[PDB]
Design a protein around this ligand. Structure first.
Ligand code: MG
Length: 603
């Protein structure tokens, strides 16, 4: 009796909802107020739960069910095809919290909903956020949640609901489809929603980039009276935001790897509503994902990727699909499988329970790292996920111009003027030039558009990291394919410039000892104040005895470094040749002053 209520009328402002007579339900009917026909954008459903928000069962249709206690918010969600999926959030707050869900609208829009909990301080200001949970659901649920759904609430006695309603923001149609939804699977999602932009700024100390986060799109209420203005606690301190991404297809590791190799937004490799086939996906995205899948099907150790590639190129099994896939694009296979192997090793080391094989289908957790902070600590509840740290990369610093791409005939759309502008933007953001990195065309695409990240390397564990040099002639030797293809051919590659955040300048060390020399290991340990390997440090020294300098960035520093293209071309007439110092533009030499490296330990 009197089960029914009207959330968007009675609880728009405030309602004390009676739970004493058993279950309460409200139709959330959007059909009168919003026609999803010819709309592309985001529905943001929210309500604030006050006193009596503990010991409740909440539901949206039969699709999403939440259980609340004082210390936890637990939920189970339906998925498109993989069956139900359960998450437990340990509360960071003790007072009110908002239930938020995002429903993307449009035939071309993403095939995931977002769920997240914003916890307030004692005085009712937004202070803490849960992980952003991304669930790939059926086309039917995506459509229904944008039309009519029912909200159920039950105790086991009343609950204070306020600011119940729904808002909408249209996707910007001036940006092509890939770019348009690029931040759907990042913490910058919060920058799409007017009430949370400043929350993101205060918690991450990163910009809400106008051109990447829909700035200027009108965020408007459709029903009820939801929170639209910022009410962020002014005392909010920096903290890592986590975005947990479920892949219904079970191909998370392959999709993550394709994102990192190709520099393609992770959303583009997610579930599609209707079979898509973007030019960037058919050329790089799908083939790279497919190579990881074929490697998994071969049942080979991730420790052996470089020997599997070598074997495929020099002593292949004819008609073996993995060998043939490697042979088609060997250098892409090197970048692809050494990235996936590093991700699998990192996953394995996150928990005793974790196995290489659980990595294949694990959720991705995207971490919004705090600007400048040298360490980006993962939340405890991310230990069962594939971690990717969001740091600015080269693509954020290319500035205005046509699309930059890497070819044997040279870097496209990359003038001295564009480099000077990029350099100026980097030093204005406190980044410091540390040297040149030579890579393959595919290596450059990955590092610039995907970001620098750990790859497995055939070398001593203690000397692992990104190998660069202050001397562009050293880098130049690596600015080509790492090994020949199946016909014994090597392509020229790309010269890159590498910049570290200014926060790392005290950890840029130098020794007269030879890098990668077993006899230098204890002396380098003494210099950096702990045994190798390098963490958030770099070491500079002779490449070989008496030789030219090189620099190793520890992988944890390298992740935070930015690579942009050099205007030093690779000469395709003289593949394997020495750098002609006459091919170095004076405008580049002028911006290439190197740091004052630390030569004695701090203590
Ligand atoms: Mg915004």
């Amino acid at each position: 009796v009197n089960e029914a209520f009207d959330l968007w009328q009675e609880c728009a402002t405030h309602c004390q909802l009676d739970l004493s007579q058993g279950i309460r339900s409200s139709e959330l009917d959007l059909t009168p107020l919003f026609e999803t026909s010819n709309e592309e954008g985001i529905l943001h459903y929210s309500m604030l739960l006050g006193e009596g928000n503990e010991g409740l069962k909440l539901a949206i249709d039969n699709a999403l069910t939440l259980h609340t206690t004082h210390s936890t918010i637990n939920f189970t969600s339906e998925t498109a095809e993989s069956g139900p999926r359960s998450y437990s959030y340990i509360r960071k707050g003790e007072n009110n919290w908002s239930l938020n869900w995002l429903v993307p609208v449009g035939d071309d829009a993403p095939a995931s909903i977002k769920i997240f909990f914003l916890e307030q301080d004692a005085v009712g200001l937004n202070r803490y956020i849960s992980p952003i949970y991304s669930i790939e659901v059926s086309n039917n649920l995506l459509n229904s949640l944008a039309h009519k759904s029912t909200f159920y609430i039950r105790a086991f006695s009343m609950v204070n609901i306020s600011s119940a309603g729904v808002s909408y923001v249209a996707a910007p149609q001036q940006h092509h489809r890939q770019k348009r939804w690029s931040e759907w699977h990042t913490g910058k999602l919060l920058c799409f929603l007017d009430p949370f932009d400043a929350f993101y700024n205060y918690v991450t100390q990163h910009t809400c980039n106008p051109d990447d986060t829909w700035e200027g799109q009108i965020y408007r209420v459709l029903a009820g009276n939801p929170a639209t203005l910022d009410t962020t606690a002014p005392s909010t301190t920096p903290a890592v935001i986590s975005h947990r991404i479920h892949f219904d297809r079970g191909n998370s590791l392959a999709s993550l790897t394709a994102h990192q190799v190709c520099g393609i937004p992770l959303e583009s490799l997610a579930r599609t509503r209707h079979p898509r086939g973007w030019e960037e996906l058919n050329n790089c995205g799908y083939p790279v994902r497919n190579l990881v899948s074929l490697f998994i099907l071969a049942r080979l150790s991730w420790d052996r990727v470089e020997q599997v590639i070598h074997n495929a190129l020099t002593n292949p099994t004819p008609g073996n699909a993995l060998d043939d896939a490697i042979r088609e694009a060997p250098e892409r296979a090197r970048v692809t499988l050494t990235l996936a192997a590093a991700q699998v090793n990192q996953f394995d080391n996150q928990a005793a329970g974790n196995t290489p094989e659980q990595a294949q289908s694990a959720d991705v957790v995207s971490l919004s790292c705090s600007a400048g902070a040298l360490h980006c600590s993962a939340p405890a509840d991310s230990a069962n996920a594939l971690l990717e740290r969001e740091h600015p990369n080269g693509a954020n610093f290319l500035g205005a111009g046509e699309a930059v791409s890497f070819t044997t005939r040279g870097t496209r759309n990359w003038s001295s003027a564009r480099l000077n502008h990029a350099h100026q933007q980097l030093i204005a953001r406190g980044y410091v030039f540390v040297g040149y990195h030579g890579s393959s065309l595919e290596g450059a695409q990955s590092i610039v558009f995907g970001g620098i990240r750990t790859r497995t390397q055939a070398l001593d564990d203690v000397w692992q990291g990104l190998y660069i040099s202050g001397d562009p002639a050293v880098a130049y030797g690596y600015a080509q394919d790492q090994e020949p293809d199946s016909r014994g051919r090597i392509r020229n590659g790309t010269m890159l410039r590498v910049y570290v955040p200014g926060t790392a300048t005290a950890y840029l060390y130098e020794t007269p000892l030879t890098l990668a020399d077993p006899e230098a290991v204890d002396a380098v340990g003494h210099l950096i104040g702990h045994p190798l390997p390098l963490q958030t440090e770099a070491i500079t020294g002779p490449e070989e005895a008496g030789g030219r300098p090189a620099t190793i960035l520890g992988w944890e520093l390298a992740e935070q470094a930015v690579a942009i293209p050099s205007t030093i071309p690779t000469d395709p007439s003289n593949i394997g040749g020495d750098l002609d110092p006459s091919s170095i533009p004076d405008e580049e030499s002028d911006i290439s002053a190197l740091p004052d490296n630390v030569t004695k330990p701090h203590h």
